[PDB]
Every structure is written in structure tokens, then in C-alpha cells.
């Protein structure tokens, strides 16, 4: 039996949110970049925020990590990132990484669900975030946007002793 | 419809510019985590599938070959044992590992590169990679940090 | 009896999402590349952050890896991937490496599921992340995201005590 | 109804045992200090014990870590610590860290319950532990403990094969 | 009443002497772990609640002061970071640190440094920094050693 | 309903033993120190026994450690010692640690309950032990004790085969 | 009552076969060695392979560690090895460990049970192998095998997803 | 009751093949050898093969290995193989090694049941397989075969992706 | 009937050959595992009983002592803290380690070192020393390699 589908469009914004199972939160933070040379890839590191840089929530354990990247409109070409281990080539990176976030896309979002699983914050530090440009990019025309989820941190929400 | 990332994953995409790229020449950029996946308690997350598909400027004339692998000698021969490279030349410019890494850990991305091909010389930031991994959930993402440092 | 289907297309970052399995958490972090000469490979250790770099935190066990690389949309070439043991030759640990990154492909990701399960964090300390590229590809042009999973850490949910 | 208490005067090293959870093990060891200039911080890198330096034993999950550092009672001045993955400036360090063990307090210590959670112990090899001293500061002057907890050895409890 | 260990902790307790401190100066010495902690199997081990106090000897005169932060460029910048000092002026010198490393493991404070402060001239050997941490009771205590080596 | 209480006195040596869990076993040693410049801290390594230094015995994971340390009647000052990882600066050392021992107050030790539970005695290897002193004291004028606690020996009521 | 008994005769390798625990897998790996002077000892560090040098996987809990080392027939004199946390002197390493693999003997290894139980992989990178030789000992003349158990790796039983 | 009991010959290849535990394989490989100087040992390193050699693979963990050695009619002496960590000394290697592999008995192998339980392929890259030799011994003339199991690899009995 | 190893373990079994020993002499070669066990994975498992049997050609004369240890700094003293030593003028040229690393981490074993002794002059590839392990069962070997890599 043939079944009519009407396949009824979407505006940009509506979108199923993914919400963090049980017991994890979300950190979400953001990096800006400097200037590309055409055809070559800068390669920045990870810098943990303030919050999570204490050596009791470099501990916390690593589940699911986003990154998406967000650009000037007057930017045009063709701008590649990922996240992988650091290397000794960094355009080696986008041969081994397990999904890239292109601009040529729809969805220009990069989803690691299994690739930093059960890593630790502190092992966060040791990655690196690589961006790859068609044509030449003048310095802070893209921002990325990475968003973690770890285990919620079981002690902060008490204030400071002072007595 | 999308493809979904399966139950207790999440999928991290970022991006990464390029370089100047020198005609007939293949260069190979190394992958680094974003700043919430750096942690040595995220990097040992298992990894799923991963995606690369690179958005290029139009003005840019020629054909070019990315991919992922380990690190190599030769970058060349990066093209021959990756399982699946995105050309700009086909209908689909994208490469699409669905067991290529399933299973491996997150810290071990740090391993690997990403290779650039171009037939053409292509000026620096003139093509960008968007690479989209998908991990475990993170275990603490429902918490504000403890105030009291 | 033939049964009909209809695929739908499906937008970029439009995924099923991995969940950590239960008492795991998935620390995501990456590294940022250098130049890369053509048809050559490079390898980086894999550097743990510091939030796990304790002595009680390098203990955990690993569960699944996944690299994924990030790369700038101007460079052009095929540049690949992978995670091994710290060997001879670089180029060798495209040969003997249970997953590769290609960016020739859709998914640019690499999946090691069984390869570090039941390893130690501070083993990751002995591992290396080795990149290809097919062309002159420049510094900083790709990043790797690596993302772990393992063990959640059994006191992150208290503060300090107050006495000394 | 407002209910009377009395607060009971606490004596130095009187406080309530922290146990580990079932299954786990804390293995405490400690570091000696090197000559610190004024107003400096110093980075040191964090060495497992022999007992734990095994291929087996880098393969164990990490719980809970907690840094408690002891100082001679000349020393004047303002000592903190904390420990984190490494970085380019070590003072960084104390603007991302968790937790930081002031020397101006009554509990010179810092307990990292989560941010360590579920790593590996080969991964403390990838952390640095960082000293910062307010005044100049002598050579072996502190001395930092620390104790992480991690999976208890699977085989400690069994004499070695006698057949060779 | 004094404060009692929560359970299943044990409270590790040593002492650190000083060296010579120049007027207006501060010192930053790292934390040592003592040999029954400094195993790799021990330095996984989680902590609680850690204290600092300091004794110093009656003939001394000034102003000390100490704390633990993690290692910094400046040492001084320590004491603006740092969740507790202990002051000789004040009416105790001490430093509670309550939720500032608990969580955090036994290796960690490796990483970390104590700070001391002197107002005037302070010989070698004149302070001494007793710090008490609490952590997990390791596994295996209630055992002799194989015999058969 | 306000209640009396008598606080009655305590003598040096009453007190509570704290017992170790069940499984595990506390290893007792001490270990001397040398001579203390005024205002400087000295920061040494630990040693661990014989007993336990084989490669069967640094798996055995560490739960709680104790530091309390004694010293000479003759000697005066103010003292201080800690274990931490091991620094760049000893006397940072103080600033991070989560418990110090001061000889000024009336209990002189130092409860490490969860800053190295599961880690190991090969890790115990890696930590430093900081000595800080107010005037000159000479070589061996304190005696640092540490008692951990670890899993008991599973292999170690044998004798060893000779047949 | 006495009981009378039979000793039956054991050929070589026909031993029980022990089993890693359940949730455990064993890793096993060997290290080649270099040339020893005679009445000496050398200290090499234990590096992780590369299936194991990810950082999902530095964050496995280890088990048991067993260090069974094979020798040339050739080569003679007393030959032991033992593995520790790193130290000034290498012969110290021989008073303190839990358990030596003497050559001399009829079984040629050391079991750690619980000397490592708990710890991380990454830990594993900071523990060391000592050889000590009674006579010249060329190089490449003993070679160790050291093999961990862990536990098992999360994700390896996943083909990487298809899409990027 | 004194019990008769007879004692029947066994031919060289019968024996029980000892089993892989459930959800565990076996791979194995082997590895020829060079020349040996008499009275010395080389120290060879472990190479994974191709099929094990990927990152996904690198993360299985380890149980049983098991390292017997097949060698020529034409040699003589006496032949000593282990496996170990890396070390200063190869020969020293020998007093480390939990089981040693001589061909003077009529077994000749080594089975290493929980030295590397527990550890992960990767950590078997950094191990070494150590041959001793009293006279001798000319290249190829020995080969060593070692068998190790680890977990199933969950993905692999896919085709690749090329639609 | 021979020694079976127990319930979950297997028996690792491998060789090394030798290089010249000079007269009175003891040569230390290090212990290097074979590659199936050289995984990270791998290296976390635990080891039982360890067994070194030596063979040596008959041509050779003297007498050949060997056993395995940790690392030192004389070689000699080897053989005065080892638990076993295989002498070739006993009755059984063989050492069985039962209980010295039952517990230990098969990692563990490249911290380790094989002791050879000889009376006499000793040419290369002369002994060659049989070891053989035990260790848990590697947990992934009843499975093919994943074909899409």
C-alpha cells in the first residue's frame, strides 16, 4: 500500500534540541581564530574556561562533544575544522579525524558521540582543533564553538568557607 | 530526514581552516579536540561515526582530495589507504567513516591527519574542512562547577 | 511480498548521538597541527589534559576512542589519520592501524571501539596520532579532536574539606 | 521552636576518615620541591610509582584525587598549588583549575572528586602538578602528597607460578 | 569534639621545613607525597578535605603567611587566587581547605605548590608546614607481603 | 531543655584507632630527614620499603594515608611537612596540598582520605614529601612517619619453593 | 588414616592456563633489549602500544601485570628483571619490588597481583623494567614479555559510522 | 587400595587444545630472526600485523599469550626465548621474565596467563621478545610464533562503505 | 601428566637466543614481550606463574647460570636476590617463578632482565632461554578483525 507523505519544510531554527542523559551537564564555550593563509590549516589548542580549570574538575569524566563553527557573512571559500590529536602535519588531521564540520553544508556542525567517551577533562588539554581554509581568512572571522558534556561537579555548589 | 546519532551519543562538529597549498601537492594538518573535549577525562570517550566534508570558495578553480588516516611518510599514500576521501569533482563532496574508527577512543583522533590535495595552487584559508565526530555523552554536563574552589 | 521503502535525505549534523554507557563520561579534547610536507606523515603524542593528569585520575580505564579532524576549507589535498603504538617508521602505522580518517569520504572519523578497551588513561601517554598529507599542506591546518571515554571520577562531587 | 547547640572545639588531626569506595584502593605517594623564586610559579611532572608502572597496571581507572601538600614551619610567605593538564604559562594554571590548596588556610589541601573521574592512570603521566611561592623559597622547603584511588590489582593476591 | 574523617577515608598527616626567606619575599616549595603514598596504585586514590597549618618557632618575628594554589609565573599572585591562608597575625593559623581539591585525586597534588610569605628576615629551618589530607583507605592494608618474592 | 555536660579531660594517648576497612592493610614506615636552612624547605622522595618493593607489590591499589610526624624535644620553630606531586618550587607545594602538619597545634599530623584513594604504591613512587622549618634545624632532628593503607598482599604467606 | 599419593611428571607448557576475570581482556607485548656489562643493571621504560595510545583508552583500570622474560640458550650467567617505579639507583629496584624473575629457576617470570591493581594505563608509562646480568650479555639477548590485563575497551566491536 | 594405573604413550601432536574463553579470539602471527653472536641475546621488538595495526583495534584488551618457538634440524645449542618489557640489558631480561622458553625440554613454549591480562594491544607494541642462543646461530633460523587472544573485534565482518 | 595453568588463564611461551659471553661473566638482556602481546591493551593483564628453562647446545662446556630479576647496577648481585636461578650442573636446568610475579601486570615484565652466567667462554646463539607465562585470556580472540576499516 503506497503511503501519501507530505515532507513539510523547516525554518532555520526548528530543530530538535539533544538533551544530556541523566547525571551529565553541558559546558559550552568558544574560541575565536587568527588569520588563514589559502590552503593551509592553523592548528589551535583546547583551553579549558576558568571554571574547570581546578585540578578537582580536570577529574570530571568526558561523554558526547560538539563542535560547531559560526563565520562572518562577508567571509567566502570553503573552511574546514575538526578535533584530533595533535600531529606532526596538521592537514594529516582531517585524514584520520572522525567527522568534519564543512561550511559547504546544510549543518555545519561536527558530532563526536564515541570518538573522546570516557576521557577526562584534564585529557582535553591534550587535543587540538584544526581549521582549514579555501582562501585567504583575515584573523577573528570565525568563531568555534565547542560544547562538552562531563559528570556534573558534585561540589560547587556551596560558597566559600569564610568563617 | 538526518541521520541521528544513536542512544547515550552525542556529535561534536568544529572546523578547521586551511593553508597555502602549492599545485599538485598534498598537505597533512594534524586534528586537535576542542577546549571541552581536551581533558584527559574526555579523551578516553569512545568514538562512533565520524564525518569530513569541507566547504570550499567558489572562486577557487582546479580539484581537491582530502581525507583522514594515520600519520605516514609519504602523504601521497595517505590517498591510497583511506577508506574514503572527498572529491570536489564527484556529486557529493564528502567522506563518511562509519566503521573506520567506531570503537576507537577519543584521545586517539590525536593520532591521526588530515590530508589536502590540490591539482591547483590554492591561496591559505581558501577551503575549510567541517568534521563531525559523535562520542558518549559526557558524564558530568548537568552541573554547574562547585563555587567553592 | 517486496516491500517499499523511501529514503530520506539527511542534513549535515543530523546523527544518531553515541551515549556513554553507564558509570562512563567522554572527555573531549583536541591538538593543533604544524606543516606538513608532501607525501609525508607526522607524529604527535597524545598529551592528557590536566584536570586528569592526577596520579589517582591515570588510573581509570578506557573505554572507546574517536578521533575526528577538523580541517580549513582552503586546503586541498587528501590527508588521513590514525592512532597506533609509537613506531620505527610513521608511515608503517597506516598499515597495521585497525581504523583511518580519510577526508576523502563523508564521515571524516575514525572509531576505535575494542582496540583500548580496558587500557589504563596514563597508557594513552603511550600512544601517537600520526597524519598524512598528500600535499604541502601549512601549520595549524588541521586539528584533531580526540574524544575518550572512561571511568567517571569517583570524588568531583564534593568540595573541599574547610580544615586545612 | 529555635533549638540550642553546641559547637564541640576540634583538635588537629581529628576529622572524619574519607574511605574508598568498593572495589578501589588509594596509593599515596609524594614529591620533593626544587628552589622557587619570588613571585614564580614552578611546574613539576607527576611520576607513577614502580608498583603501578606495569603494561597491566597503566590500564586502571582513576576515582578521586587529593593533593595535600606539607611545608616546613620556616618558610614564610604564601604557597599554592594545584594540579591541571600542561600548558605554555604555568600560572594559567591557577586561573583554570578546580580547586587550588592555599597555604593561608586552615586545610591546606584540594580534593579533585570529578575531574579526574573514569581516566586512566597512564593519563597522570600527561599532568603536571604547579607550585606557586610568595616569597623566595628554598630548595626541598615543600613537599606535595599526593593520593589518588584507583581499581584495586586484579592479581596481588596470589604467589608467583613456581614452574618458571 | 574534633572533626572526624568521613567514611571510608583515612587522614594522611606529615610535616615540610622551611628555608631561608628573604624580607618581603615569598617562597614556593612543591608537595612530596611520603613512600606508603607514592605508589602508582595509591596515586589514584580520591581526596577529601585538606589542612594546613603551620608551627613556627617563638623567636621569629614578622608576618608569615602561606597557602596552596597550583604552580603560577608569579608567586605573590598566589595569595589573590588561593581559597585560604593562614596569617601568623590572626587569632589561628590555620588554612581549611574544605571543597577545594575534594574530588580531585592523590596524584594531583603533585601538581600543586605551597606558598610561604615572610614580612621580615626568616632563617632556614624556622617554620615548619604541618598539612593533614584525607583520602580513600587503600586496599590493601590488612595484609603482610607475599613472602615468596 | 538545656542539658549538662561534663567535658571530661583526656590524657597524651587516649584516643580512637582508626581501623582500616575490611581487605585492606596498613604498611607503617618512617623515614629521617637532613638539615634545614631557616625560612627553606627541603622536599624529598619517598622510598618504599623493601617489602613492597617488588613489581607484585606496586599494583596494589592505596586507599587513606597518614602522615604524623615527631621530633626532638630540643628543637624549636615551627614546622611544617606535606605530600604533593612533585614541583618546579617545593614551597608552592604548601599552597596546593590538601592537608599540612603543623607542629604548632595539638594533633601534629596530617588524613590524606581521598587525595590518593586508587591510586597505586608504583604511583606513591611519583609524590614528594616538603619539610619547612622557621629557625635552623640540624640533620636528623624529625622523623617523618607515613602510614598507608592498601590492599592486602594476596601472595605473600608463602614460603618460597626450594623443592 | 595415611594416604598414599603419585607425583605424575609434568612436561613443558603443560600448565593451567589462567584466565583474565570477567569485563577483563589481556594485552600482551615484548621489549627487545640492549647490550649489559657484566655485575649491571639497565632501566627501560614501558611504552604502550598503539591500539592502547589513545585517550579513551590511557583511562583503563588495570588488573594483573606478568613479566615472563624469554632468553637466547646460547648466553650465560645469572640474568633478573624486575619492573618499579622509576629511582636514582637501578640495583635499589631489586630490594624494594615484590617480585623478581630469576633465570636461574625452573618457572622464569613474576606475577604483580596486587601491586598494580587499580591503577591507569597511562600510569604504565611511569613505571620502569630492570635487567641486571651476572656476566657480558650482549645486546638483543634477552627479551621481555609483559602483559597486562585491562579492562575491555568499550567501543571496538563498531564499524566506524558511514557519514564523515 | 593401592591403585594399578597405566601410564599409555603419547605421539608428538596429541594433546588438548586449550580453548579461548567465551567472547575472546585468538590471533596469531609470527616473527623470523637474525643472527645470533654465541653466548648473546637479541632483543627484537613486537610488531602487530596489518589487520590489528588500526587505532579501533589498538584498544582491544589482552588476555592469554602464548609464545612457542619452531627452529631448524640443523641447528644446535640451546635456545632461550621471553617476552618482556624493554630494558637496559637483554640479558638481565631473563631474570625478570615470569616464563622462559627453552628448547633443551620437551615443550617447548611459554604461556603467559596474567603477566598481561588486562593490558591493550597498543601496550603490546611497547613489549619485547627476547632470543639467547649458546652457539652460534645463523639468520632465519629461527622463527617464533606467539598467539595472543583479545576481545572480539565488534566491527569487522562489514563490508566497507562505497554507495 | 604436566602442570595445567588455571581456570581463565593461558601459557604464553617463547624464546630468546644469546650473544658471546666472555669468561667469568654475566650478560643482563632485557625481556621483550612478542607482538601479539605488545598491545596497550594487553600489557594490563595479570600474570600468574612464570616458568625459564634454558636450552644449550652439547658442544659447550663449563657452567651457565641464569635467572631473571629487576634492574641493578651490578649484574652479579642478580643472582643473590633472585628466587629461583636454572644452573646447568643441577639435575633440572629449569626455574619456576610460582609465586615471585603472580599479581603483577604483563607490562610489568619489560622492567625486568634475564641474568646469564657462564664459567667459560661462550660464543653467540650458544643458549637459548625458554620462558613461558602465564596471563588472563586476552578478551578479544575469538573475533575477526572488523573488515571496514
Redesign the interface.
Known sequence: R?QP?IVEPLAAGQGKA?K??????????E?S?D???????????????????????????????????GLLPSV??????????????????????????????????????????????????????????????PAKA?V?H????????????????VY
Chains 1, 6, 8 share one sequence.
Open positions: 503506497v507523505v539533544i544530556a542523559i541523566a547525571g551529565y551537564s553541558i559546558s559550552k564555550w574560541a581564530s588569520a588563514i593563509t589559502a590552503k593551509a590549516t592553523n592548528a589551535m589548542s583546547i583551553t579549558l574556561p576558568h571554571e574547570l580549570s581546578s585540578e578537582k574538575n580536570k577529574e570530571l569524566k568526558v561523554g558526547r562533544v560538539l563542535l560547531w563553527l567566502a571559500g570553503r573552511i574546514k575544522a575538526c578535533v584530533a590529536e595533535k600531529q606532526a602535519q596538521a592537514e594529516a588531521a582531517f585524514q584520520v579525524a572522525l567527522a568534519v564540520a564543512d561550511s559547504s553544508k546544510e549543518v555545519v556542525a561536527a558530532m563526536y558521540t564515541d570518538a573522546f567517551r570516557g576521557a577526562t577533562l584534564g585529557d582535553l588539554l591534550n587535543l587540538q582543533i584544526y581549521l582549514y581554509a579555501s582562501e585567504a581568512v570565525v568555534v565547542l560544547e562538552v558534556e562531563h559528570v556534573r561537579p558534585t561540589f560547587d555548589d556551596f560558597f566559600t568557607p
